[PDB]
Amino acid sequence: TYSAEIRRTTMGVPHIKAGNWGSAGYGFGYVQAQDNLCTMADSFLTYRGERSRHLGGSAQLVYNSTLGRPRNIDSDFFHRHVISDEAVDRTMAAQPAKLLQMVEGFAAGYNRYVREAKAGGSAHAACRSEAWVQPITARDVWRRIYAANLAGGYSNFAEAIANAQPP
Amino acid sequence: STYSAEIRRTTMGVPHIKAGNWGSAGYGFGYVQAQDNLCTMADSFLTYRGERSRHLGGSAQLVYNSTLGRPRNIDSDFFHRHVISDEAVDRTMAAQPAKLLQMVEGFAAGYNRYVREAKAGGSAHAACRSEAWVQPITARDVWRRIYAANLAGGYSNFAEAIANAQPP
Amino acid sequence: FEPGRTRAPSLQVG
Amino acid sequence: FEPGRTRAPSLQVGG
Amino acid sequence: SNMYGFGTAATGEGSGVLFGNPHWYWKGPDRFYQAQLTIDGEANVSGVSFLGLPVIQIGFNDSVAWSHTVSTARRFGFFQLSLVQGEPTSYLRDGVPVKMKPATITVPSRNADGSVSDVTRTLYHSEFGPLVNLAGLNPALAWSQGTAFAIRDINGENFRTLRTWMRWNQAKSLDEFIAIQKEEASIPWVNTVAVGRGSAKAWYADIGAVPNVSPAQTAACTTPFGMAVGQALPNVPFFDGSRSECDWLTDADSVQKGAVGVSRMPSLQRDDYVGNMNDSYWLANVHAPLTGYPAIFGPAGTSAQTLRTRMGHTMALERLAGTDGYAGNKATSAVVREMVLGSRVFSAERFKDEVLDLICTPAQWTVNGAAVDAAQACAVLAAWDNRGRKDSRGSHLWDEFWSRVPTASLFTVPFSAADPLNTPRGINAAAADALRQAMATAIARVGQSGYALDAPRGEVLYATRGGTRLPLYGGCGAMGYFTITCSENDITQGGYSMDGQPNASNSYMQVVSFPASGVQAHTFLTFSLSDDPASPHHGDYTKAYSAGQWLRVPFTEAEITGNADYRTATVKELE
Amino acid sequence: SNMYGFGTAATGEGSGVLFGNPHWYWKGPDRFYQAQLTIDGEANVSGVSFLGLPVIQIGFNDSVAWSHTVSTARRFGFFQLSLVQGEPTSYLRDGVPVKMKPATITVPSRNADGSVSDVTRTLYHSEFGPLVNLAGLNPALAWSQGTAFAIRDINGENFRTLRTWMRWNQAKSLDEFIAIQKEEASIPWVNTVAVGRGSAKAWYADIGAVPNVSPAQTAACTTPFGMAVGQALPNVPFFDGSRSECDWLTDADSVQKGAVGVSRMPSLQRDDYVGNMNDSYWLANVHAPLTGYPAIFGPAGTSAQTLRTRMGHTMALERLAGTDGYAGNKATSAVVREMVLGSRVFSAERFKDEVLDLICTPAQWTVNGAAVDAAQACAVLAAWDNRGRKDSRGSHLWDEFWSRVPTASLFTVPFSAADPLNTPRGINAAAADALRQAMATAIARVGQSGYALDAPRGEVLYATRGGTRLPLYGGCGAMGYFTITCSENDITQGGYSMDGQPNASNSYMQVVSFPASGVQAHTFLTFSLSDDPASPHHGDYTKAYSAGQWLRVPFTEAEITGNADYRTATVKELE
């Protein structure tokens, strides 16, 4: 039972209210998705290394970011190699309880909105029916989280890491 | 002994050059081309002479798309210096009939005439007229350009790759 | 030689 | 080693 | 690029009709420039040059008119070099070390701080041509201790091109035009179609400079590396430099060393029509295919033709059959002027109904587990005339859709050489989910671009001059357009704008015929004469192109001086 | 990115003022998203998160407000691995070969024809971190048969980041904020500035995760390659991976293996102000410089500050001197709100007159042998207010000029650590011709763009929303703007549009203070909440930013419910 009250004020600013961390996550993930689904859905393709599957290997990243705009194939390789299951595990293993719940709630909240966008409505006409608008996992959020830490190091050398090969 | 061309323009500005000889024809044709397209042409002679990097910086891409694609200025310069060398221009010119050598001589002179005009004033070509890469050219330069047009099917397609071929 | 690392260039003039 | 061939990467996060 | 040559049988008149339609840059130094050169008693020629070129490359005189399209014949080869051990700048020639020729080159380069400093590097030539770095093609193809690579382009030693065009500019009949082409064998990378005054047959030829290799050579000289990479360089000879036996051959009637001889180069003369749309020589004329020419020229009956090629020949046949909606059954100048702007869309004409029948029943879908409303999409397309005209409604939806349809087993009826215009065909019933997926995406792209699904193409496809968006017509070859107006701009980036650097599109256009009174030429320079936004000739020609009003270009002195916009001035200086 | 922390001495009230001004992406997943998190008995925080992040990164609660600017501190290093002969995937470590752990990865790739196939390769780790191709950096740095390179990012082992923002979100005072930062030493790549309720001092720190190397170590561990490429990677430890003495050190108060100890990381408390605009820790406060910290945090007074940094501190001093045109001499919430949008242009204020005096007499020139009339340019720039406000006239001329001025020997008065706000200065009279060159070019670029030289900035700098162009103000740091609105678009391609993917610009802004009633906060999210063009929250916030109308964000329960646009809803679900 996740449960959050979403209060919107001027300019749409959401004010999530919940009795626990997981439910706060649930509200926050929902509103972010509600307002920014196409960017977010594209983003999880990035962090998972699943861009080339949907958008082709040679196409560049759609959006700029601390990752720059490398080719999809190289970005995919970079994220899989560096943000691997092991790294995600090691990340998660070092988290407090409430944060782990928050992230659970966040993914489920995001996933709630995806189901809603798939059902209908005129929001996000740009991507609402694309295969890459799809549910995500707590671990995928953790991928994103880990990725935001790498801005000052590994992110700058994504192409370079994805192409490190012996003679 | 003087170049002399009559330039007749009609609807859409289409120029009809009328001349007594091939040199003078070249002169008028060179002139009207510059008069309508100075900025593109001037930039382009940097390309064929391999002088892009000095003016525009080595790490920038070619401004315009063409048969050459859009490599980095530095690579483009090396390609043209290497492939369209003096010897290549010397070998190209040796093969031409006298009238063409003359026409290209005129063409250069006519282009150069317009450069003198544009440098002197006027509002045409406001985008580039003050720039240092707007400069007179030689007959040999026009021959570089002619030679470059032929390479479209082979060398032009591997310009960056030719500019970076060196041993371990 | 790995065929999967082959990057076909621009061959059609124009 | 030829310093002339050095291509420095961008190191400003956000730039 | 497209071109037609129509014979006297196809026109009805005493002379044929030539349609020149190169698809070329709209900006940059290779853009066409329209002009007439008149040298007292030596030449009177009109047409178009690359900026920087002094003679006419595509045009006409009082006797002949011609055009060019890029040929499928490869014009270069690679040569693999076996390097001398210890000496990575020397290669073996039949067990004999040969020095590569070095060149030390310095280039001044402006540093982003202002100052200008020298950057130098030493590059190399083999006897075949310049050394080439092929690591980009595949990392295993680097210049190593034992292996290196040169590239040979036959035009490297072809100094005859400019002489050829000049001679063409002066030519007094088709016969002489053809004779010139045979003597020179210089045409570097294009087909040629010409029509002559008082000549019944239009001319087609891929007669130019082409690398000469035998079938025996191909299978014996291709290196392991050449084998491994062949598929990325189709028909490009990748030979063993080591062996002199692997050098390009010279025929008895070869004009150049290493070049294919004249008699073994494709040509055809027809009193009905010849045409090309960038496929091989093979289907120069649909009725009389050409075969047996050297492999380097491309496939001749084993490959499907592009949608644009299929559209082009369909247009030619339907004109002459009188079944294309124009008057009569003759390829007259006036009628050709219309049809080549017509903007018929082959993919639509052939497959739209098949597609809609299959996916619009019902028009409410589930795609990727998401509800999609395709009532509007389905109904707009069903209502659409399958053209890319200014007032065509829905045409852009089709573009966004068709170019996203996966081609793997899309057609149930495969290519047949005996039906080259109508195969492949037959939309695979199984493709239904792939088709709905592609349509969903198309709906979304047009959605976020801010255009309505039934928007008139004129508002989507445009060129801006003087601050106003001139409405345009046509589209991209990929969709099966013949009339080509192909933007590089994504539809979400303010529509198919033509203001940047578009992919190869209609540039110089001519419709030339020879009535009794003398040549007549109708022309376009789609982008206009002058790249200067301030010039009176930055946008006028483009305004006429938008309106589809062909310019009747004055040719005689009387026509020139008689022109409403006649201006003259004479320039001179010492030599 | 900019940020100010003002203490009670500067504000003259019970608490200080916090100004948070990250310059960041306008699109993409790293873009900011404004929201409030109210958790029962746990947290009540408001501010901003990257899309996909669940805790507030920059913002405030009832007790503390903070922001971040990107720090000059290097967060990575290289390691030169000496490979084992015959075994290029193994590197030597103190004489013994150590095998690089492989990972064989397969990525599905959509092919340009629709079909989906796998592309596979095998990548590697050293114990330092992933292997890294550095041929791009320099050809000689290729993964050879003898040598290879690995990169390490201390944040790769940093797992305390989310917890830290989580705890800051809950923090109950400035002292608690400080202690969390000191406890966690986790902040990955940013400076931090904070202000607390009833706390006189403002906080600055570059305390976080930072590589730990000694000056002794860098002298003994930097390889010949590391020396050779050292200037391209300033303060980046390019160490020898073969020697274990070169491993990153660990201090006695070091929170993480290989990171710097908490007491050797720069911080400062001031009751007047701390600020940072992307330069090093050095000048957190102009009156009391910070010195004596590890090299890796960047230059402490051995480098010229950027123009923006000079603008930033200048603004802060002149506010407190009461010499900036604003009322009083205190940094109050209300004044700070106006001040940070004023769009002053350092380069103009400091160098315009000298440039104009140097090159404008006379105003008709010879530039590269060509006549150039610069009277209009000279006059418009003389008349201009040195600001980038919506109605500033000629500001774009200055942008196109200044960014083209060659910087070599530009100033005659070199940088002096004693005077970091006024040095370098003194426009070199010997630069007159280069300055004329740059100005000539600027006149041309504006000319192409179709804007008049005296166009109001608002028509050049804009965001488009709902079909209408909202006039904007500000510019790029290169001209020495503090207010950042920095287009990636060339002036010729439709002005300084902010509709694409602009450069790091004003994104989430906040001015937070703590009066007796409780936390007050005024905010902007310049690009608006929603990336959907159909959303009413796609352009509302941008309208407000254009008008310069700060949004008082409701924070308490009565404020949220009392808001004129209050809508509430509830979402629930199992697990």
Numbering used by the authors:
A (entry chain A): 12 to 178
B (entry chain D): 11 to 178
C (entry chain E): 8 to 21
D (entry chain B): 8 to 22
E (entry chain F), F (entry chain C): 1 to 575
The authors write:
The recombinant MacQ protein exhibited bifunctional acylase activity against various ranges of AHLs and against multiple β-lactam antibiotics, including penicillin G, ampicillin, and amoxicillin. The MacQ protein is comprised of 806 amino acid residues, including an N-terminal signal peptide, and belongs to the N-terminal nucleophile (Ntn) hydrolase superfamily. AHL-acylase is one of the enzymes capable of inactivating AHLs via hydrolysis of the amide bond of the acyl side-chain to produce homoserine lactone (HSL) and fatty acid.
This was quite unexpected, because the SP was not found in any previously reported structures of penicillin G/cephalosporin/AHL-acylases and is believed to fall away in the course of the autoproteolytic maturation. The two heterodimers consisting of the α- and β-chain are arranged face-to-face, resulting in the formation of an approximately 170-kDa capsule-shaped molecule (dimer of heterodimer) containing two SP chains. The unit-cell of the P1 lattice contains two capsule-shaped molecules, which are identical and can be superimposed with a root mean squared (RMS) difference of 0.47 Å for 1512 Cα atoms. First, the SP is observed in all heterodimeric units of MacQ in the same conformation, both in the presence and absence of ligands.
